[PDB]
Amino acid sequence: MALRTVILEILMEKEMDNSQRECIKDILTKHLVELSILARTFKNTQLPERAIFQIKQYNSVSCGVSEWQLEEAQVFWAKKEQSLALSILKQMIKKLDASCAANNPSLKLTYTECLRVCGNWLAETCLENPAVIMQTYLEKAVEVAGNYDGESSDELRNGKMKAFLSLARFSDTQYQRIENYMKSSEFENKQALLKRAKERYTVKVQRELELDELALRALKEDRKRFLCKAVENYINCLLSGEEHDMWVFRLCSLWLENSGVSEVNGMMKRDGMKIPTYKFLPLMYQLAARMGTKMMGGLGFHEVLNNLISRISMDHPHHTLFIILALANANRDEFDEDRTEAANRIICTIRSRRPQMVRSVEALCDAYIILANLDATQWKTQRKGINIPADQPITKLKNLEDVVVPTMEIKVDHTGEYGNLVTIQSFKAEFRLAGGVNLPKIIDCVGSDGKERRQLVKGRDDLRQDAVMQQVFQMCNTLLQRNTETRKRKLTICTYKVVPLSQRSGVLEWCTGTVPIGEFLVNNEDGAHKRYRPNDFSAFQCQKKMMEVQKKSFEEKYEVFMDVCQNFQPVFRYFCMEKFLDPAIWFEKRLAYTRSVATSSIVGYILGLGDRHVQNILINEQSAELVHIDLGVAFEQGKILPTPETVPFRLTRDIVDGMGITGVEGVFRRCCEKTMEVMRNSQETLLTIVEVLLYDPLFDWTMNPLKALYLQQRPEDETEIDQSFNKVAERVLMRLQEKLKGVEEGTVLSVGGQVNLLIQQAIDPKNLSRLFPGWKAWV
Structure with a gap:
């Protein structure tokens, strides 16, 4: 920046000879504006203001275009004093x-930029009357629809993206207003049911009824118009570019x-549902689950909607159609x-109808899924010792x-080409088999080029109930990709290359020797170290603690726990400390694994760690990651437990195993605060995702308590009502509001103090x- 400013000064002082040098100095001022935009992206308060003052002192006094x-x-x-030049704009x-x-x-994009800036300012204010807001929205929409795809200023791509942004902002404002005049209107309808029990009247009753009817009709019309506009924008963006998937x-x-x-x-x-293969693949990622949703209609428009979805999913059918068929081939109890x-x-x-692949593809698909199901059901009957080879x-x-x-x-690298x-x-x-209730097989699927997939085929268990975690991980990865600093600080999330077959069988997979910690610490106590535990x-101590918490009162437990700590902390302390065969490269792996643990803790705080x-x-x-298949506890599932507790879990x-002293806790607090402040800008997307995820009464494992979750x-694991759905949904939304831009106590309590209190609760x-x-x- 300093070198560029010096060059700008030199050129401004040495360009007073030719006539084109005036336009050259104009481009110099344009580069100064670009540097000011860079300072804006840097979020500074002194350098951008000094650059603005330099521009003002320079030839910007001519005011050609202004x-x-x-x-x-x-x-x-930069100067936080806003609401100064809106009327001037x-x-x-x-x-x-x-x-x-x-x-x-x-250069007609300047008018679109003006309209978008005015819309942003009106949305930030939000306190003025709705009449002027609607007038400005109509004016902006008319100007966009009159000036788009017109002259040659990259309007087909840049102007198209600007029109997409304008239509998206308009549709988001209208959808927020509709959600308000739906929820608060249901509250007002409850109030009107309470009031009108004294039985219309032209004073307030007939007026309210006419208002209800007319406003419902007008809101339906406006919602249809906004949905058509948003669908057209999303289609033309699928032809143009991404970043419209959330809307x-x-x-x-x-x-x-x-x-x-x-x-x-x-x-x-349905007729305007034209999108490219690459964008349809991200849409097919959600359509795979949308096909098995609660939409059930044969005579209504549900059949037409299903046909339109199938026709839209025709493109890119090498993997999307296969995934859709695998998801649909679940309700078949054939032998x-x-x-x-x-x-x-x-x-x-x-x-x-496609004679190339689809027929034989589906045939072989049902063939091998029946093959895997029969293999599981026939191998889970016989019993042998520890290692059970010869599955012939x-x-x-x-x-x-x-x-x-x-x-x-699977083909995780999904593309539309x-x-x-x-x-x-x-x-x-x-x-060879592994642990668990059933008998999974360590299957090495050797590809033609030598790709050996380590799969684990299981059966007789409900595995598709928790398959939404992969979609949640994909959405979180997309959010991290949309976030800028996440790639700067190298944030990653554990993914799963697991495709379950149905609610009766599935195929798990390992990445590279996923060795759990239980038998590891057991073998460490057996052969590695002794003299303490x-x-x-350890099993006898855990059984005594179970008997104490089952029979005795809460008293005398803290002293026994402190004694157990003071006696057996060094055991796992030096168990982790002897895993320090770390080479010079592991100096960064130490930070990588701990940051992965931190990201897992953040995901747990956000989504109810299991x-x-x-x-x-x-x-x-x-x-450099620690993958954990929790799949057990949702937000409220921590309180459906016998003698329920409220613990961040x-x-x-693990914190002391990573690092306990030398400000590492403060480093992790700062990292978590930065990540939460970055993620605390997509509240509407998060709420929509949660609302989509809580509308699945079929998967009663998460967020659907039936008989206290069975x-x-x-x-x-053996002693180690639509009103209820609505209550769970409302309380989950309230708790999400109590996690972003607020807490349960109402006060702000910025992410710093919030993480401080969370760590205090986890340590107490x-x-x-x-x-x-x-x-x-485990503690």
């Missing part, structure tokens, strides 16, 4: 649209919740959502090792003593 009200807007951003606009309107140059998903969820009404609007959205079954059958028959005589050894056939179903694919024609046999004595057990917490060799053992589902002995005996042994 775009300074837009370029030097730091009077509100409006006056400049109405003056440039009076005389210069007849001689509008090719597209919000509009799709709103249309699915308002299904059946506005048949003309639904037909228009009430009947309308949905018929609909997906019709969708499959329609997609089978079951199903002809995978029907002769799955002879050449299209494979590689399919082509040369990979095959898994080769396979192995005689796989063996495995049998279970933590031996087979749950897994250690990774060199992936953070163990100090009595806590045999609490902790009450939370680590009340929760459970197993987790006490």
